[PDB]
Design a protein around this ligand. Structure first.
Ligand SMILES: *[C@@H]1O[C@H](CO[C@@H]2O[C@@H](C)[C@@H](O)[C@@H](O)[C@@H]2O)[C@@H](O[C@@H]2O[C@H](CO)[C@@H](O)[C@H](O)[C@H]2NC(C)=O)[C@H](O)[C@H]1NC(C)=O
Ligand SMILES: *[C@@H]1O[C@H](CO[C@@H]2O[C@@H](C)[C@@H](O)[C@@H](O)[C@@H]2O)[C@@H](O[C@@H]2O[C@H](CO)[C@@H](O)[C@H](O)[C@H]2NC(C)=O)[C@H](O)[C@H]1NC(C)=O
Ligand SMILES: *[C@@H]1O[C@H](CO)[C@@H](O[C@@H]2O[C@H](CO)[C@@H](O)[C@H](O)[C@H]2NC(C)=O)[C@H](O)[C@H]1NC(C)=O
Ligand SMILES: *[C@@H]1O[C@H](CO)[C@@H](O[C@@H]2O[C@H](CO)[C@@H](O)[C@H](O)[C@H]2NC(C)=O)[C@H](O)[C@H]1NC(C)=O
Ligand SMILES: *[C@@H]1O[C@H](CO)[C@@H](O[C@@H]2O[C@H](CO)[C@@H](O)[C@H](O)[C@H]2NC(C)=O)[C@H](O)[C@H]1NC(C)=O
Ligand SMILES: *[C@@H]1O[C@H](CO)[C@@H](O)[C@H](O)[C@H]1NC(C)=O
Ligand SMILES: *[C@@H]1O[C@H](CO)[C@@H](O)[C@H](O)[C@H]1NC(C)=O
Ligand SMILES: [Ca+2]
Length: 501
């Protein structure tokens, strides 16, 4: 009798544009193969659609209003409370905990040390080639180097001749080989960068998605019923040279159709590129015969809009920005134990069945208790309200029962996002704490998304639910794309019904 290892794979800005989530265009065979042996959650949502608030949230198992981290300019242990993290908890329980790539968000939000010395057994590994993503590293048709958003590259014509996710993969495999020697179990966090911008990927993956067979988003127009407060102006992508040359109007655009299809091409290519890296990682796991002793959790920190509602990037409460993939492989539980190989590398350039599936509405803040339980450790207790004074507790439910009384909150996935004003402006994507004046709280059920943009006081961290600036109500059955806001024609009977037993 032993304890199970954990391989946690986190992808930056990955929406569920994957074969195992019903996307019949994107080629993600290795992830689909992971899913075929796993439990796939169809309705998983991040608590805030931006890197640091989301990552600090689900790494401490607390919600953004407990971490009080809505930007990326505060360290929770000083700002809110000495909240313990997932890897810290495993390390305290005899695990060797290791971080590769972007797990914590770098900078102050992790105290510049990836939350050292609490979380990791040794200083995390960050791939060196990441620092060239936003340099003049994209060779154009006329032979010059540019800092382009769409950046298909020959690996032999970039600095250091590699890419950050290839480095992360290589280093993760080596650590797995080392741990096969150790007597202790491992908790390995691998944080992949793509499809986060820029779209710098091996140019061969671009051939998988010819532009002729690329369509726009189903709802590329900005909906009439979308209140301006809920619109994000996607300012970060406007700084890239190729984007800047199009002279796209601020803040509503639109992006020229041809470039919209090119963005989707490069995003899909980056996903397939990501998929091969995951393939290499999982295939190495198989060769080392760790498949029968290692939990694999695969998810993302938030989504990314590709023209839906005239939006791009995250910084939103729409499903496209909050809906994330979430897959759990549990040896001998989600699939039969394996010289059998479960994750052989699959080549997307070669032209499966859905594994277990769950439609329950779940939240990234439930990641902490789930992994702790699945690994055989003690599940931290539920948090009180507030829990600033508590170091180890969880505000989300454990999903372990789901692998074989109706509280209304078990029917909800919560999301939120701040705004500095009602009209989209320069900092509406990523407002700093002092500049936050509105907080958009969103409720997502199997039936609808209900959002209210309410007055917010950043000095007291106080929401005023009597100062509603605007509201949104989208119905899954009739309006899955969320194009027809029904909040003005509503009275609140949907919330009442949810409360009534
Ligand atoms: C913040 O907490 C860390 C670690 O918290 C540990 O885990 C919690 C679940 C709870 O059981 C705590 O009592 C545990 O200590 C603190 O780090 C410890 O600090 C003490 C002395 O300060 C030291 O002797 C221990 O070795 C440290 N352990 C670890 C794992 O780092 C830290 O001090 C706390 N910081 C503040 C400001 O309270
Ligand atoms: C919390 O909000 C209430 C209500 O907000 C008011 O109504 C909104 C629709 C919008 O018009 C806001 O600008 C309004 O303030 C606040 O209640 C108001 O309080 C002020 C000062 O005490 C008073 O002059 C107003 O008459 C009140 N309005 C109502 C409708 O009661 C309340 O002050 C807010 N609380 C905090 C802590 O900011
Ligand atoms: C976050 O890290 C910084 C630096 O690593 C800590 O600030 C100082 O760090 C040095 C270590 O080089 C210590 O000797 C000092 O005592 C630290 N100063 C203070 C005021 O603590 C900082 O403390 C860390 N934050 C937390 C919450 O532990
Ligand atoms: C929902 O109703 C609100 C108010 O009932 C609308 O907001 C108003 O818009 C008019 C312009 O048509 C402004 O003059 C008012 O000042 C606004 N009201 C407030 C309180 O600011 C809103 O446009 C409606 N939305 C939809 C989709 O019908
Ligand atoms: C997982 O499977 C591998 C091979 O599929 C098992 O490898 C054995 O490991 C034990 C000690 O861990 C060795 O004594 C054996 O020689 C290995 N090979 C075989 C064929 O048994 C491994 O034990 C399995 N892990 C668990 C927890 O059962
Ligand atoms: C688009 O897909 C169809 C279906 O396989 C294929 O025949 C066609 O060649 C594709 N488009 C291009 C430009 O190759
Ligand atoms: C961008 O467009 C505006 C009006 O649409 C025009 O005035 C301006 O000169 C354009 N800039 C460039 C660099 O073409
Ligand atoms: Ca992100």
């Amino acid at each position: 009798t032993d304890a199970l290892n954990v391989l946690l794979i986190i992808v930056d800005d990955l929406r569920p544009s994957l074969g195992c989530y019903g996307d019949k265009l994107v080629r993600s065979p290795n992830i689909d193969q992971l899913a075929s042996h796993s439990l796939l959650f169809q309705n998983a949502f991040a608590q805030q659609a931006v890197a640091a608030p989301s990552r600090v949230s689900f790494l401490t198992g607390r919600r953004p209003d407990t971490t009080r981290l809505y930007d990326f300019n505060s360290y929770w242990r000083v700002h809110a409370g000495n909240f313990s993290t997932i890897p810290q908890y495993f390390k305290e329980n005899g695990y060797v905990t290791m971080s590769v790539g972007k797990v914590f968000h770098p900078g102050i939000s992790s105290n510049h040390t990836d939350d050292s010395p609490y979380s990791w057994s040794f200083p995390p590994y960050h791939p060196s080639s990441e620092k060239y993503e936003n340099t003049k590293t994209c060779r154009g048709p006329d032979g010059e180097l540019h800092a382009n958003l769409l950046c298909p590259v020959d690996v032999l014509d970039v600095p250091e001749g590699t890419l950050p996710d290839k480095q992360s993969t290589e280093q993760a495999i080596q650590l797995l080989e080392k741990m096969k020697t150790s007597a202790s179990p491992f908790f390995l966090a691998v944080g992949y960068h793509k499809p986060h911008i820029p779209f710098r990927y091996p140019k061969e993956f671009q051939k998988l998605y010819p532009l002729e067979n690329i369509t726009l988003a189903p709802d590329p127009e900005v909906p009439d019923g979308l209140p301006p407060v809920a619109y994000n102006p996607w300012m970060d992508i406007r700084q890239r040279e190729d984007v800047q040359a199009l002279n796209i109007s601020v803040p509503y655009g639109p992006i020229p159709v041809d470039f919209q299809r090119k963005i989707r091409q490069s995003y899909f290519a980056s996903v397939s590129y990501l998929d091969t890296q995951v393939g290499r990682l999982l295939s190495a796991l198989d060769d080392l015969q760790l498949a029968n002793s290692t939990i694999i959790a695969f998810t993302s920190d938030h989504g990314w809009a590709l023209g839906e509602h005239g939006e791009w990037a995250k910084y939103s409460n729409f499903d496209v920005a909050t809906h994330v993939p979430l897959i759990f492989y549990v040896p001998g539980r989600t699939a039969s134990l394996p010289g059998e190989k479960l994750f052989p590398y699959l080549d997307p350039f070669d032209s499966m069945e859905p594994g277990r599936q769950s439609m329950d509405l779940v939240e990234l803040v439930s990641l902490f208790p789930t992994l702790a339980g699945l690994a055989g450790l003690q599940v931290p207790p539920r948090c009180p309200v507030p829990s600033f004074h508590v170091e180890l507790c969880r505000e989300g439910k454990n999903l372990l029962k789901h692998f074989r009384p109706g509280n209304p909150r078990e029917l909800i996935a919560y999301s939120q996002y701040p705004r500095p004003s009602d009209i989209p402006q320069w900092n509406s994507d990523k407002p700093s704490l002092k500049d936050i004046k509105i907080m958009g709280y969103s409720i997502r059920t199997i039936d609808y998304r209900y959002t209210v943009w309410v007055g917010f006081n950043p000095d007291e961290f106080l929401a005023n639910f009597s100062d509603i600036h605007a509201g949104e109500l989208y119905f899954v059955d009739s309006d899955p794309l969320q194009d027809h806001n029904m909040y003005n024609d509503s009275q609140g009977g949907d919330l009442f019904q949810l409360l009534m037993p």
